[PDB]
Design a protein around this ligand. Sequence first.
Ligand SMILES: OC[C@H](Cc1nccs1)Nc1ncnc2[nH]ccc12
Ligand SMILES: [Cl-]
Length: 167
Amino acid sequence: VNSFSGYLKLTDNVYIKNADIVEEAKKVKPTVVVNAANVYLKHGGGVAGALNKATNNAMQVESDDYIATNGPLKVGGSCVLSGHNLAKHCLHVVGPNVNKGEDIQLLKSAYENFNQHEVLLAPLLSAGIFGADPIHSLRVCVDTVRTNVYLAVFDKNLYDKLVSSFL
Ligand SMILES: OC[C@H](Cc1nccs1)Nc1ncnc2[nH]ccc12
Ligand SMILES: [Cl-]
């Protein structure tokens, strides 16, 4: 039993809700919130900009030190950093950005990072400003993640579309 509330159950382990991931994380304080990151951990817009704003830029400060030490992530890769005031940990995961010409096949590799954590609050990877089809992202999530994932969907029209179209 966990403190996630109001989610629709899609499968044994995947749950979905229309919610602002920032407001969700503040309420639940999950062990892990997933950020829709880029390889430079530059949290400018989308989920990343919103999460970083909610940390008063502490996420960006921590991320800049991470990059200075370790260099960029790989597309499809991840790193675990602090969750600041939002969660215990933030799993920064880089899905492919179609608006940069990146290989959508790497979306499965991106979701594989979730399997290293028993429970996560997450957005749909590569959706929104990353330019992939969200129906596809949900399908890859369901077919790749085996741990318990609570998906927050920002856009109500898309939330309704993902449920009604879910197979
Ligand atoms: O796939 C990620 C998703 C993509 C979008 N598509 C249409 C509108 S935003 N973005 C978000 N998802 C959840 N919480 C969020 N807070 C801020 C952004 C955000
Ligand atoms: Cl977005």
